[PDB]
Amino acid sequence: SSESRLAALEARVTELEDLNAIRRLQWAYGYYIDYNRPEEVAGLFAKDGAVVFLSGEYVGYEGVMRLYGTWFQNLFTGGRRGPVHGLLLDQFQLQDVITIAPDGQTAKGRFRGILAGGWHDDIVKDKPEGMPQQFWESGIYENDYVKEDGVWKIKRLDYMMQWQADYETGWSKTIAHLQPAAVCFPENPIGPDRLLPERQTWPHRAEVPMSFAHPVLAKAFAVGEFTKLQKKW
Amino acid sequence: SESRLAALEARVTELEDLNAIRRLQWAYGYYIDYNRPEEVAGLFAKDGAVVFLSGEYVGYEGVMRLYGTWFQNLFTGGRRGPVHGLLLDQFQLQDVITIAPDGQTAKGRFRGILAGGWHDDIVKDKPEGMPQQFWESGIYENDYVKEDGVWKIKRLDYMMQWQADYETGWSKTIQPAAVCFPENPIGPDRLLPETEVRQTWPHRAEVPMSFAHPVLAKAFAVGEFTKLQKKW
Amino acid sequence: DVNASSESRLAALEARVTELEDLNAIRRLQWAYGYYIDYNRPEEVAGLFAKDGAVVFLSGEYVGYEGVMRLYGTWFQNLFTGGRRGPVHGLLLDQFQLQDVITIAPDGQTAKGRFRGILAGGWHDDIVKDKPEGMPQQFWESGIYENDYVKEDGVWKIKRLDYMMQWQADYETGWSKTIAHLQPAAVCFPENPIGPDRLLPETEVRQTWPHRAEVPMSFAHPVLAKAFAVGEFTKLQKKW
Ligand SMILES: COc1cc([C@@H](O)[C@@H](CO)c2ccc(O)c(OC)c2)ccc1O
Numbered sequence A: 001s002s003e004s005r006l007a008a009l010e011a012r013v014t015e016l017e018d019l020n021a022i023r024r025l026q027w028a029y030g031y032y033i034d035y036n037r038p039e040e041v042a043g044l045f046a047k048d049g050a051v052v053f054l055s056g057e058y059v060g061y062e063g064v065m066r067l068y069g070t071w072f073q074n075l076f077t078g079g080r081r082g083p084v085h086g087l088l089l090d091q092f093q094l095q096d097v098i099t100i101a102p103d104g105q106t107a108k109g110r111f112r113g114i115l116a117g118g119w120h121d122d123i124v125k126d127k128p129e130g131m132p133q134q135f136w137e138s139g140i141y142e143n144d145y146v147k148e149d150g151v152w153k154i155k156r157l158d159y160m161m162q163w164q165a166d167y168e169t170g171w172s173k174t175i176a177h178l179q180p181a182a183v184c185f186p187e188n189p190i191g192p193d194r195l196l197p198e199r200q201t202w203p204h205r206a207e208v209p210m211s212f213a214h215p216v217l218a219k220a221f222a223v224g225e226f227t228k229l230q231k232k233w
Numbered sequence B: 001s002e003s004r005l006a007a008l009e010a011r012v013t014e015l016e017d018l019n020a021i022r023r024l025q026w027a028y029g030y031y032i033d034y035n036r037p038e039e040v041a042g043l044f045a046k047d048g049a050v051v052f053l054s055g056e057y058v059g060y061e062g063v064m065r066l067y068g069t070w071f072q073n074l075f076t077g078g079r080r081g082p083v084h085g086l087l088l089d090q091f092q093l094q095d096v097i098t099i100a101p102d103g104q105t106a107k108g109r110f111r112g113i114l115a116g117g118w119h120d121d122i123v124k125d126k127p128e129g130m131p132q133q134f135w136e137s138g139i140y141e142n143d144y145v146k147e148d149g150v151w152k153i154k155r156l157d158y159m160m161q162w163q164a165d166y167e168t169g170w171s172k173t174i175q176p177a178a179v180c181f182p183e184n185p186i187g188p189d190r191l192l193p194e195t196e197v198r199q200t201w202p203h204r205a206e207v208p209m210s211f212a213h214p215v216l217a218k219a220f221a222v223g224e225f226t227k228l229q230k231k232w
Numbered sequence C: 001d002v003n004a005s006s007e008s009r010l011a012a013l014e015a016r017v018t019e020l021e022d023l024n025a026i027r028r029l030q031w032a033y034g035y036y037i038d039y040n041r042p043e044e045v046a047g048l049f050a051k052d053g054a055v056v057f058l059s060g061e062y063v064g065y066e067g068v069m070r071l072y073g074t075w076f077q078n079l080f081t082g083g084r085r086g087p088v089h090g091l092l093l094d095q096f097q098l099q100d101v102i103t104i105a106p107d108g109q110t111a112k113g114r115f116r117g118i119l120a121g122g123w124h125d126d127i128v129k130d131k132p133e134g135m136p137q138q139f140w141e142s143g144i145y146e147n148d149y150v151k152e153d154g155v156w157k158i159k160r161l162d163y164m165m166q167w168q169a170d171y172e173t174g175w176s177k178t179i180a181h182l183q184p185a186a187v188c189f190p191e192n193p194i195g196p197d198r199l200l201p202e203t204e205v206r207q208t209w210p211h212r213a214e215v216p217m218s219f220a221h222p223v224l225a226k227a228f229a230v231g232e233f234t235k236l237q238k239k240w
Helices: A003-034 A038-043 A060-077 A223-227 B002-033 B037-041 B059-076 B222-226 C006-038 C042-046 C064-081 C230-234
Strands: A045-053 A056-059 A087-100 A106-119 A134-148 A151-166 B044-052 B055-058 B086-099 B105-118 B133-147 B150-165 C049-057 C060-063 C091-104 C110-123 C138-152 C155-170
Touching: A003 A038, A003 A087, A003 A106, A003 A134, A003 A151, A003 B002, A003 C006, A003 C091, A038 A045, A038 A060, A038 C230, A045 A060, A045 A134, A056 A060, A060 A087, A060 C230, A087 B002, A087 B086, A087 C091, A087 C155, A106 A151, A151 B086, A223 B037, A223 B059, B002 B037, B002 B086, B002 B105, B002 B133, B002 B150, B002 C006, B037 B059, B044 B059, B055 B059, B059 B086, B086 C006, B086 C091, B105 B150, B150 C091, B222 C042, B222 C064, C006 C042, C006 C091, C006 C110, C006 C138, C006 C155, C042 C064, C049 C064, C049 C138, C060 C064, C064 C091, C110 C155
Parallel strands: A045 A151, B044 B150, C049 C155
Antiparallel strands: A045 A056, A087 A106, A106 A134, A134 A151, B044 B055, B086 B105, B105 B133, B133 B150, C049 C060, C091 C110, C110 C138, C138 C155
């Protein structure tokens, strides 16, 4: 009942540091992607970590460099570390809800991003056909983390786009586009390492289940009890 | 050593308390974006209240009536969301939380920015007089209680600051007293005093800060600094 | 560590808790800063600063209470509200604050922090008669902060507030349509009543969106730290 108190405090302070460290991975991730810097992004990942993009997984430093570098950086900046003249890709990061597992060796986190993106008139000659010149996009992250040798790293980065808009017309006017199945790397040089089982896009919606327990009611939370209090109108 | 331990334990409790109160607001946001009124109501103390457009919605009943009977019916036709073509993302940010000296209540300032709308696929279901797609921002100055060791929302006070049709923007935007529940099926339980009534954008009104000046505290006096400012 | 003394363990916990409180206090200065500037309240802003602190605006420094009152009061408050503490009818200047990455120095007495803002700004049609010529009626703007902090007598204060605008847009036309405007060097106060106390070197002059320039990260790589080397990862990237 002094050793017990110290050990219990040490655990509590470790969890507070764990939360800060995991939130920092996401906030840093954002500052690196805004500048199309895939190297810093890949270094955030456990070597067996993955990024989920278009219903596949891009695995390890190779997969992360392929997605953010071979695909995105070539597409957006012509294969230059950013930022560069006339290219905006700000993915503002916010609203972290992080859950450390009981053993303190893994964690989950919900986050979200809002992207303001575009090719300025000065560089729109370099914009790929079929991309809007300036756009908004938002999505939800439900990510996994691992603590390796005392350091938190990204184990799974799963960004689920919720909506997109052309700046000029807004989210209400976006045309649905049917998403074909990806071909994997290596046959597809920018493809995923592997496919997920069985997402079509805005205006279609699908819940992203919360990784976090109800913060007041926890496992006792029952929807139906509360639904009884609502009426038709 | 007992004095030192107890003082450390208190400091760690306050750090946990700040995280727990911020979590209520961030979770609140993820639930409201999905028109999930049950999860929202469960965040509240049983004697909690929501202040919306100068009325109070009291307890689980008031909270279910505001977010369920009114908003969920309005936006999704009375379905837990998210649903096809309906956007109601209220991004939550910029927490400044003050735990009371006794550690049993707290205040927090927060803010939200809402991207909202009916996609062309579902605008047939949009009520008349609502814009198809809009931005809105507002400020929260909330109250919290720690009940049986658990932080809960005591008073959620959201004050809308501006709204814009997506197409025209906030500069180009163009309000009766509420009728209470139950005569108004979606009304508040009670009205705020006229003195606390807010008119909307372009009309503005300060939302006083719940937090002390973070550097000067009680010593902060505006007039001392105003002396240094000139006309231009 | 079951082999460490209880004293060493206590002291090490006390240091750890102090660092966690330091991070919260520094983030609070930026979040509070934002709520004060959104209301055009220069006095509360000035009080956040060390007395020898500065704000970097357009390649100059505004130094101490005087400089901070001059930038936010004499210049900005006069420009936006006609010299009234806000908020006021029809005037929007919301600079949403987010995405803190804060690094406390080893000695615990200084700190750096990266942050960013996104501004939704404008004059409502009701007050646009009072808008200065050459300013858009409604606009977006975003910028990056790389700030310095000092802990004075156990209180964290802003030592250097360095806001670097990254982009701006007229609401109607968007960031892709913004016209580059060549930015002349500032004239200092006092010859310029709203000017900086001193200029930064030409080498620190920034031209504006669509021109871009990195704002180096104040933080180490959060996983690899000083071991992070770009070239090792660049080897894994191919042409496409
Ligand atoms: C009180 O809690 C909140 C309420 C809001 C509403 O302003 C939003 C979304 O419910 C709204 C926007 C446009 C409307 O026409 C509308 O009509 C009822 C409601 C936003 C944030 C809150 O926390």
